Each structure stands twice: as structure tokens, then as C-alpha cells.
Model the fold of this input.
Amino acid sequence: DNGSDCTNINPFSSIYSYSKAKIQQSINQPQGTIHTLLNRNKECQSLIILSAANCSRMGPFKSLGPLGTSLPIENFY
Amino acid sequence: MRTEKPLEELYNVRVERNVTKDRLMELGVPRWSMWKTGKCKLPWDWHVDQLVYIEEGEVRVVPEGSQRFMQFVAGDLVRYPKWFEADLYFNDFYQERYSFRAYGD
Amino acid sequence: RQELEFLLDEEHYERKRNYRPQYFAENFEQTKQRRDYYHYTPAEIAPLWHDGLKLLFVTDGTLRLHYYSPSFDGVVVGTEDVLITPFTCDRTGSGDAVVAGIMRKLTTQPEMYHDQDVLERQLRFAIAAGIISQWTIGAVRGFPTESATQNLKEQVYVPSMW
Amino acid sequence: VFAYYGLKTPPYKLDALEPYMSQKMLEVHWGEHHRSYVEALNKQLEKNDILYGCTMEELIKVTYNNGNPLPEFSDAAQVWNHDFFWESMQPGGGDMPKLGLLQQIEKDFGSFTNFREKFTEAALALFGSGWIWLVLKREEKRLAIVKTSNAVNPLVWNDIPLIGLDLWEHAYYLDYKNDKAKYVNVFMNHLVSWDAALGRMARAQAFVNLGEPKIPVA
Amino acid sequence: ESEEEARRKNWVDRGWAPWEEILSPEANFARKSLNEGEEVALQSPEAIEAFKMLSPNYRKKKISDMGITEDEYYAKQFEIKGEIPEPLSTMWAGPLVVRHVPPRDWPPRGWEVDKKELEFIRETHKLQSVRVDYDKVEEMVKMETDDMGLDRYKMFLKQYNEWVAANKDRLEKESYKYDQDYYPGRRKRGKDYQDGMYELPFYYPGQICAGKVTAIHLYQGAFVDIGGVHDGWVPIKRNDWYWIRHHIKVGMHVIVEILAKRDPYRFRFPIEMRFIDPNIDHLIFNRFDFAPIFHRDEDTNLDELRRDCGRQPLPRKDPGVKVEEEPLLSNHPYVDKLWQIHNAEQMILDDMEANPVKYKGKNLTELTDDEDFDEENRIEYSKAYYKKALLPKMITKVSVKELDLEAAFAERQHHNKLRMEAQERGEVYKIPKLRRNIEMDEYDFIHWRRSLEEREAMLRDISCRRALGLPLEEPGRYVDPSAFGKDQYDPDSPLYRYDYWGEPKNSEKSKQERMTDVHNKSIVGKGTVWYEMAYEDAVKERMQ
Ligand SMILES: [Fe+3]
Done:
């Protein structure tokens, strides 16, 4: 009767290969940056999901590269 | 992803393919134990190392909660790590030569 | 709208209406997560234009009426308040009233071709007619009159609109 | 083929510590014991190219593998370990710490005499070969004295080391046959380097802040 | 506690910071007017000033009274109050002597090059162990060029140039496929990509690089452009930007040191660096414990993600049992698969012996029982079986393709011929064992020997690890004995279950009655049991 166990699909069958495309990219997740709480560190730590619905952007508002690697120094003192 | 991170090194399962017999007799492969099984499923949790020298068939190892497996042809020497939780899926006749080794050789 | 998308491209617009910004909201109005009333640019309708064409209407249906002329574009806003009468709540004929209102205003007002404000003030009439035509079971049974549509236009919009 | 292929000669000469550690003994420890380690580390890195392109501090942690060390962990750890040791000793002697390190020792271990007592106790309490370390814990922001196994270094627990001693016998057998407490006392009295420890603590202060913030009045 | 102590605590743990909070005039008047009272005359000077500043002409006259431009007032609105720190100075320790060394991890996974060139390139790693005396450096300064030896480095460059021209399009396609929106730290694409940018393999931890600050995030940190396709990240948390913002500004040319390089697929910021020229190591108190990662849709197993990123394992409940103080395992997985086919072969042989008409006319070597056998439909479960009680049932479609009836036929035809003559001899014959049972016993024996060898190795492994100071159990998995908590506990003492109150030992449901009924029906009599022993003891007494 239990059918929710999709993970029990034999990898040798074509159904396992078809499930990769049948199951689209999961978007049920809140899709945001996980922002931890420093104040809630002592108690049960909670999480704030910052996403596009909480942040906005203000449009108008109106050489370079590696030099080298330091060599070891003889006079470590 | 174009995976350049295989499960043989993600999980520390060192596999030597097409091993030469001189190193085998140097380790002591023929003077080991035996294990035979057909088509079965063996959930096993490791407590020590295990040098498996497969002899006859094929074994597909599936770690816990994973959907990708690693395949071992009949000519490989596999070293299963400690604290490994997997599900060995067998399909046909299988024989091996194992020797559990503690910390050190 | 569905016909225009089916003619131009269906999957393209279906993917555009599901852009899903992940880091920030660029337009500063996508944070509210409202419906997508996409105004098609005049370059997207270019493969459908010709010399003899005078006006075009996208007609989302009692909500938005995108009008395209060879000199200007625009959009009018609607109401869609069919939930005020749940027991009748029949929208069998709604585009017919809009087309009738557009034809009436075109036959009466000749300035709708070379003016943008007049065009909006006249399309609000068709919008009001289509809104009234959804509160009666049956298309021929619930077609409104001119006085009722003008009353709805004066009661919904602000005096500066009409 | 080989990275880290260098004995990394100590800052001082092999005869700089002659009154306390004979020039022969140093020659053996550095010349033979250490050199060998490097050679084997190069031979092991030639085989595995994935672990070749990794820094020392990262190679040690990736070869420790959280309790189940890879076959090349012991060797690389030793090479690093030895390097730290040579530099953890200076020509002349070490009398007392300086401005910052002495204050931190007084704050953590109470006093410098208690610190020396605990260091000697931890050095003599170790059994077998191993190393003793004076490290700086990140999450705790304090100095601690940890004793480890044969080749394990405090880099496996994300702790910055400052001073280390080799308790492996190879180090002391030639001049101090079996008086290991003597060897410790000599290393703590006339062979400890506090300038190097202070410099390493200054370097570590870029990763762990030892101080109090400036709180505005608002 | 005291106000000062409280503010200190907040700064240390919660992260309070007295920000500017730029306000409107209408609000400034509200904040500076509600302090006096209500419908009362405004006596404070700042309240009267805020009341007068509610008129636009008053503000446009006051801005001209002090002689400030229209933009000057708007710039002065967004001004940082409080004590401003002193301008920091750059005190260089000593000469900087460097040397261009190719990265140790230059060849990516999947790119094959000639071995001799890679050997000559890697040869330079040996020369890095030599020491240089910094003080005498000035003495050996040579201004004449065209004498420097950089063949190795040049060789690296040659290889690099090839690799970028080989894989630029592939990297750009992957960036467009896996990354949707651009963010500081991702691959520069589209109009932001100019030819000549150093790609990610070029860099390596330990290199000092000069760049400019192009982004400043409150929660993440600063972002420095080092002239490459991927930006650099300096971790600065939320609360430190109250003092660091006076020393780090967008567009400032800074000198940084790369300390780690990571994979851009998993990690958000592949290059993390520290500041050298604007040394601010005395103002960073909050730090990142683990590098940020991407929780994508492809990774479904959390263990693979944990092993790829390098974080601790997922904690589990702490088992009270010991791995050494527990019995062995003596059950082989093939036992069931061999038992079922053995019973099937026995039943088929019995059915063929019962009805010889069906067995006649067909060769016993090959018997085609069913030609519609399917491996996919071999497992059939039907819960409709209610012959004795409502319970589920399963059906197994055994295939006769692998049934070894060859030896079974001979064994049965040899055993029945002897049991019949034993019955005729006035004796009862009980067959001790069969070949299939012997094979199952051999499988059980080899599995038991495997388990015995495993525990024999474990008994030595525990000892040595304990002796040398190594963890016996994986650190980070069984750390919490019962920190995970508040679960209903069956036990009464936790109070998650009832305990007698005023002698309330009564228990809801838990009817022993239903059980009593099945016992009572069969054996109602409350007689005293005479013989009582286990089934194994019964077999022992029977065989004895
Ligand atoms: Fe040593």
C-alpha cells in the first residue's frame, strides 16, 4: 500500500532514469539566504529566511592581480 | 552537475583495479577467509577496516540515504572504511577474500 | 491574451511569468508577489502588424485592455468583481459586451484613432459593460444598457478618469 | 612530482645550541629523521595528485579524516611538526615571556610559575612518543596546554599552536639518555623561544580576537 | 543588572548597534514633541525648531541662512553621528620579497597534459623551502633586467593560456546553466566579462593581490575585485560594520591575501581573503565557523553534502549498548532465498509424484512450468487473505529456470525407496537432514565466521585506538545523549506519563482483556502449569 517510498526505485529500470526528469527542480523551499540569530544562540536557535520579498534595490542612486608569495625568512626572530 | 567527485573518494573507499598477483601474495590474499552469496541485500555497519578481494561476480554498494552507487568488477581490491553504513546489492554469484584489519598494517 | 501568446510563443511567456528572483527585487515592485500583467512591447507584436491595421486589443478580460496603435501604446485597468453575486456568477458572454462597447465608441467618437486619453476614456466604457455582463445567467439575458454601464463607469472610476 | 620537498634548514646553525644540545644530535634529528620523512611524503604525494594540490594545514586535516587517518597523515604531520619545533627553539635561551604573551599567560594559567609547573607535569605524564603543545583555542579564546599522540598535531581541532616539544625519544637519547625530566627542564630554561611564540600569537590575532569591543554610549 | 553591563551583554551576544535612523521632519517632530506632554506648550528649543521645520519655505530659508547648496543639506542628512575613529595608518613590517610560484593544484580534474612539462613546473615547489635573509636584500639588488629565470613560471603560463582557450565556453555555459542571477562571488558573464581576466585556477592560497572594493554587505562582508572572473570575499559580520565602515569604503584600492580557494559550485564565495593594507584585525569579533554553501535541488542525501562541504555529521540518538558487549550475527541473507526455492522444489516433486500422468511424457531434465514468468512481477502482495483472521499476505512467483531438480529427483527417488522398506520392516524413518539444509548451514557458518573475524579485529582495534588516543566512535554523531528533547516519554517518572495521584494507578485502555479473551477461550481453566520449559529445552530433552 505504501507508495510514497520513491527512493525504493531500482536504478537498473528505466523508471529510475525517467524520474530524474519527471521530478522537476524543487521550488517548495523558501529560496532565501539563511540568516541565523545571535540573540537566540543561548535559547533554541531560530532562523530567518531573507528572500526577494524582503529586500529591494535602488537603481539610480544618483594593476589588479596577484603580486607574489612571501618567501621564508632567515631571521625568524 | 558534471560530477568530477566520484563516490570512491567522497566516501573513503580505496579501490585498486586490475591488481597484480605479486602484491596479492605479498599482502596474503590467498590465506584469507571466504564468503559466498547469490542475489541478496546485506545492510551492514562497519566497525573496522576490511580489504575485500572480489573473486567471481559483481557487487554494487549503496551508501545510506544515497541514490548513486559504486560498482566493483571482479578484479578489484576494495578497502571499506570505518563507520561506513551501506547496502550491498548483489545480483549474481559472488565470492571474495576478506581480512579485517585494525588501526595499522 | 492566451490567443496572442499561442500565436507568438506560449512556453516563452509561461517561463517569463515565473522568473522567480532569488537574491533581490530589481523593479522594487516585485516584492509584493502579485499577478503578472505583462504589457507586451510594440516590438513583440511586430510580426503581426501590417499597413492596413489601425488598432489592436489584447483584452485580458475585464482586467486589462492593452491597446496598440501605429503611434502609441497603453493599458487600461479593470475590476473583475464577479464575487459580489455568487449565486448568479455567470460570465458566459463577457467579450461580446466589450466588443460592442468598443464598436459603439468607435462609431460615435472619431478622435479615438489619433488620441490616447480619449481612447482610454472610451475603453473604460467597454470595461464597465463587460463587468456588468457577468452578473446574470445567460448572455442575451444579462446584456446591459448604456445608462447602467455609464453609471458603473462613474461609480468605479474617479471623476478625473471619465 | 614532489611538493614540500625541502628540509627547511633551521634559522640557527647546527652548532648554535651546542652547550645544551650537541651538534651531532641535531644533525641526526634533522639530517636523518626529518629528511626521511620528507622523502616519503614526496613519494606518497607523487601517487595521489588530488592531495598534492593542498596546503599543509589543509593536507593535515584532510588526511586525518576525523579519526580514521589516511596512510600519508603521519608523515605530513611529522614534517610540519618538525618544522614547528626547530623554530620553536631559539639560540641562547628563554627567561620569561614578553608584553602580550606574559599577560595572556597570567590571565589564563594564573602565573608563569604555575604555567611552567603544568607544562612539566604534562610533559612527564605523557607515555610513549608524542608531542606537547601550547595552543590558542578559537571558540574559547584562551591558551591551553594539550598533549597529543605520536604524530597528531593540534591542527586537527582548529587550534593555533605556539610552542611545541618533541617527546619522541629520538630527540633526547644521545645527550640525556633516560633523564627526560632533565631534557624538559633544559628545553624550558635555555631552549624555549618566547619571541617566536609572541610572533605566532601576533599572527594568530588575525584569526582570533583577544580583547573587548568598544561599545558606544547609546 | 546595570545599564552599562546590559549594553555590554547585548553587544557581545545579540548584536545591538546604534544606527543613524534617518527620519523625516514629521517624525523628528513626533520624537521631540511627545517627551514633554500633550496639548501642552512646547518649551524645549529643539521641539520648537522641529515644529518650525514642518514648512518647506522655512527649511529653504534656513538652508540659505547658513549658506549651503541644495545637495549639501541632503548630504548632511545622511551623516554619521557619534564618535568617529581616527584615520588608520599602514605600518609595513619590512621588505616584501616575493616570488611567482605556479599553483600546486594547477591541472584541474579531467585535464591531461604532457608529463615532462608538468614535472618541470612542479620542480619549483622544492625551491620554496630555502630561506632568504631579508636585511641583506637591499645589498643584492640588481636593477638590470633580462637576466631573471622564470622558465617554469612561463611554462605554466603557456599551459594556462591553452586551458582558458579550451574551456572558456564550457565554463560560461555552466555558469549560465547552474547560476540564475548574478551576485558578488559568482562568475562574471555577459557585459561584465572582458577578455583577459584571470580565471579561478590561476589563484592559490598564499598569494598577495591588489584590488579595489566593489561591494559591501552588512551580513556577509566586503567584496574585493582582484582582476579576475570571480570576486574576493573578506568575512565581516553584522555588528563590526559600526566601526569598520569608517575605514572601508566602496571604491578603495586595497591589498589582500588569499587564504583559501574553494569550488564555486558548492561554495558561494570561492575565494576568501584577508586585508593587508587596511589592517582591521582589531575590529573583527564575530567570525564565520563554516564557509557558506549552496543547498541546491540535485543533492538529496544530506550525508553526501556534509562530506563534500566538510562539516560535522548529522547527530543521532546515543545508543546505550556497546559494540563489543553484544551477540554476534548468524543469519545469512541467502537463507530465505535458498529456503524458498528448496521448499518449491520439494513441493513440485511431491506434486509430480502424486499425479504421475502430468509428469509422464515430459523429460525431467527440462520442465517448462510457466512461460509467463516476469522478474518485475515476482513480488505480489494481497491483503485480502482472511481465511483464519484479517491479516496481509504475500505471493512469491518462483521461476523453474534455475531450480536444480536434477539431483533433487534422484535424492527423492532414493529416500522414498528406503523409507517404504523401513516402514515395511516395522520401523519409522525420520530423515535427519537434506543437502539444501546442509548448504544453508554452511552459509550460516561462513557468515558466523565472518562476524567472528570482524569482532576479533574490533577487539584489537579498540585497544590500540584507546592506547594511542584515537576516537572509538565517529566524533559529531553521538555527542548529544538527550539534548534533543521534550519527546513524550513512556516512562511515568519523566511526568510525560501518569503516576498515581491519590493512588491513581488506573490505566486507560491497555486492555489486557482482549488478550485475556484469546487465552481464556482455549484454556479457560485456571489450573497450575506442571511442565514449563523452552522449545530448545524440549528439543534437548527429546534428543537426549
Ligand atoms: Fe622528532
Notes: The two ends of chain A are 75 Å apart (CA to CA). The CA atoms of residues 32 and 54 of chain A lie 10 Å apart. The beta strands of chain A are 33-36, 47-50, 65-70.
